[PDB]
Paper text:
Flavodoxins are electron transfer proteins that participate in a variety of reactions in prokaryotes and in some unicellular algae. The identification of flavodoxin as an essential protein for S. pneumoniae infectivity and the fact that flavodoxin is not present in humans open the possibility of using it as a target for the development of novel and specific antimicrobials against S. pneumoniae. According to its gene sequence translation, it contains 147 residues and very likely belongs to the so-called short-chain flavodoxins characterized by the lack of a 20-residue loop that, in the long-chain flavodoxins, appears intercalated in the fifth β-strand. Either structure shows the archetypical α/β sandwich flavodoxin fold (5 α-helices that pack against a five-stranded β-sheet with a 21345 topology, forming an α/β/α sandwich).
To understand the molecular basis of the interaction of the FMN cofactor with the protein moiety and to provide a structural frame for the identification and characterization of SpFld inhibitors, we have solved the crystal structures of the SpFld in the apo form and in complex with FMN, at 2.18 and 1.69 Å, respectively. Overall, the holo (note that the holo form contains selenomethionine (SeMet) residues) and apo SpFld structures are similar with an r.m.s.d of 0.8 Å. The main differences between the two structures are traced to two of the three FMN binding loops encompassing residues 10–14 (phosphate loop), 57–66 (50’ loop) and 92–100 (90’ loop), the latter two sandwiching the isoalloxazine moiety. Smaller changes are observed in the phosphate binding loop upon FMN binding because, in the different apoproteins studied, this loop always carries bound anions: a phosphate anion in Sp apoflavodoxin, a chloride anion in Helicobacter pylori, or a sulfate anion in Anabaena. Accommodation of the FMN into the Sp apoprotein takes place with changes in the dihedral angles of several residues of the isoalloxazine binding loops. In the 57–66 loop, the main changes are observed in residues G60, D61, G62 and E63, while in the 92–100 loop they occur in residues D92, Y95 and D96. No significant changes are noticed in the FMN phosphate binding loop, possibly reflecting that the conformation adopted by this loop in the apoprotein is highly influenced by the phosphate anion bound, which mimics the equivalent moiety in the FMN of the holoprotein. As previously reported for the apo/holo flavodoxin pairs in Anabaena PCC7119 and H. pylori, the entrance of the FMN cofactor makes the two isoalloxazine binding loops to move apart. In this reorganization, existing interactions between the two loops in the apoform (Y95/G60 and E97/G62) are broken and the protein expands: the holoprotein surface area is 7745 Å compared to 7135 Å for the apoprotein.
Author numbering: 0 to 146
The structure:
């Protein structure tokens, strides 16, 4: 394939899963091999094997990580991912005044590992509309371009 992308997601009410899937589908159409897994089913260290690492996450309450993301975040923060390209996407809402703060938190943890951000993070309000789909597709196409 063009390269190997590993997308890890957390999703409570399905929006973030759907977003992960949109990104995965464009990457597959561009010729990459892609794995798409819920965060409870993989290890952060599996990222060592990939060329592109992506986290798709919702945000829980007052700007927290998903409960199920806490262990994955810890494991990821302890890795050295020099030479990997990353990106971060997610769904959120404004009810807790911390819209997609988990997306920002995962951007920072990736910076700390030495990986390089390949495209601007994509934050979606609740479910994806076609305008959000376009943004996600441009994100995937920019990562593909960088290889």
């Amino acid at each position: 394939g063009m390269a190997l992308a590993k997308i890890v997601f957390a999703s409570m009410t399905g929006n973030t899963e759907e977003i992960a899937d949109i990104v995965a589908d464009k990457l597959r159409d561009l010729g990459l091999d892609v794995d798409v897994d819920e965060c409870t089913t993989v290890d952060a260290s599996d990222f060592l094997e990939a060329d592109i690492a992506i986290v798709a996450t919702y945000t829980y309450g007052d700007g927290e990580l998903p409960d199920e993301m806490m262990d994955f975040y810890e494991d990821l923060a302890d890795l050295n991912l020099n030479g990997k390209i990353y990106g971060v996407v997610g769904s959120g809402d404004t009810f807790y005044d911390e819209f997609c703060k988990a997306v920002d938190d995962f951007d920072r943890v990736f910076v700390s590992t030495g990986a390089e951000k390949g495209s601007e993070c994509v934050k979606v309000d609740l479910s994806a509309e076609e305008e959000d789909i376009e943004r996600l597709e441009q994100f995937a196409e920019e990562l593909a371009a960088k290889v």
